[PDB]
Write a structure and sequence with these properties.
The structure is a homodimer. The first copy, chain A, is mainly β. Chain A is built from 1 helix and 7 strands, in the order βββββαββ. Chain A has a single domain, classed as Cystine Knot Cytokines, subunit B. Helix content of chain A is 11%, strand content 42%. A 3-stranded antiparallel sheet of chain A has the order 3-6-7, with no helix packed on it. Chain A has a two-stranded antiparallel ribbon with strand order 1-5. At the A-B interface, helix 1, strand 6 and strand 7 of A face helix 1, strand 6 and strand 7 of B. Chains A, B: Belongs to the TGF-beta family. Chains A, B: It is found in: Secreted. Chains A, B: This is Bone morphogenetic protein 2. It is classed as cytokine.
Chain lengths: 106, 106
């Protein structure tokens, strides 16, 4: 766990490995992706940072006791899941914030 | 840099230390705060996590090559700043995402 600038990485999630296939009927898993990568001080353009992230990035370069801005997901999307609630009812719900579309520094 | 659950920490930022007092007339600095703290697998309630964060937290507990959800700011607020643009014009602008109100796992 350590690499260049903040970016999106591939990550398929199998519901059976995380023990969710018990309640999630479908899909069996999904391409979720994830974010990772240092948020540099010279602030990459392409990479987006909130004003706070920028302020913190700068402070960090003049004082290291303060952490750099983290590389988290900034753009997400949803996926459908057919599952069974606590009462064994079959539900088809559209779950938000499941897939990482874009990454950024925050 | 290493502590318990994700939480907000105090952080005053002096524009002179980060070399911004040159263009920012006022204020001289401000209480920005910052976020830090591990995002545990048993997922603290009070602490908020996106669906993705939850999925990633879980994966992480069954595979460590994948990073835990990061502790970033989830609720921010703005502050006013009187500054001078590139043309030496005095501007009073309300800058968004400057202050960390709440923290979370993403």
């Amino acid at each position: 766990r350590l690499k260049s600038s903040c970016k999106r990485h591939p990550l398929y999630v199998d519901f059976s490995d995380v023990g969710w296939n018990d309640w999630i009927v479908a899909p069996p898993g999904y391409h979720a992706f994830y974010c990772h990568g240092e948020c540099p001080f010279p602030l990459a353009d392409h990479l987006n940072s909130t004003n706070h992230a920028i302020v913190q990035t700068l402070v960090n370069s003049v004082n290291s006791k303060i952490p750099k801005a983290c590389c988290v997901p900034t753009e997400l999307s949803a996926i459908s899941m057919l599952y069974l609630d606590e009462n064994e009812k079959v539900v088809l719900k559209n779950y938000q914030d499941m897939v990482v579309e874009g990454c950024g520094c925050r």
